[PDB]
Amino acid sequence: NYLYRLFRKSKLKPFERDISTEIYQAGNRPCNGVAGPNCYSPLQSYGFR
Amino acid sequence: GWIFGTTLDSKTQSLLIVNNATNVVIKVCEFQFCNCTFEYVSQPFLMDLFKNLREFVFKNIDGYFKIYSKHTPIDLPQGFSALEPLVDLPIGINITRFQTLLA
Numbered sequence A: 001n002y003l004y005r006l007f008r009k010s011k012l013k014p015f016e017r018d019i020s021t022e023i024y025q026a027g028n029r030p031c032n033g034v035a036g037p038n039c040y041s042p043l044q045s046y047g048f049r
Numbered sequence B: 001g002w003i004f005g006t007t008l009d010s011k012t013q014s015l016l017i018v019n020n021a022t023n024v025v026i027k028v029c030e031f032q033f034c035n036c037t038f039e040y041v042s043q044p045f046l047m048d049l050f051k052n053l054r055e056f057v058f059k060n061i062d063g064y065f066k067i068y069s070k071h072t073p074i075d076l077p078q079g080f081s082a083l084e085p086l087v088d089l090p091i092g093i094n095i096t097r098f099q100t101l102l103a
């Protein structure tokens, strides 16, 4: 139930929050909502045991 | 009013001053122009009556969104005048675009 963000276009500002989960574009090819080889979900779940 | 924010996909909602008697409610939630019910009720900012110049030189410092307000009675005329601080709001968002609200 806990998530964290990995990839962003820029850095953060102090005391700010990010809610939008858009597919990250790691290359020249646009994603357009498709998680391809160069496109990944920015939120990864905490695997806690 | 003022409709501050970046793009139209996340947050992007701001001030709602109406000048009747109340309802200057500042809202930072999801809304689509053309999941949150935030509010901030206070007094109207724009109180004045020989034209008047209401000047706002508001800023934000890492989310600390503050407004300096002054109404000065008189192209922009010369001479010097002060502007006084009003409030401090932790809006906590990143803003890159603006547009006025007219009605």
Ligand SMILES: *[C@@H]1O[C@H](CO)[C@@H](O)[C@H](O)[C@H]1NC(C)=O
Pocket: A010, A011, A012, A013, B006, B007, B094, B095, B096
């Ligand atoms: C704020 O948003 C703009 C456009 O949405 C972006 O370019 C910028 O990197 C963001 N962050 C800042 C100014 O810290």
Ligand SMILES: *[C@@H]1O[C@H](CO)[C@@H](O)[C@H](O)[C@H]1NC(C)=O
Pocket: A019, B035
């Ligand atoms: C509110 O936003 C969250 C994003 O984490 C989403 O999961 C949820 O479905 C949204 N709720 C409504 C009512 O839109």
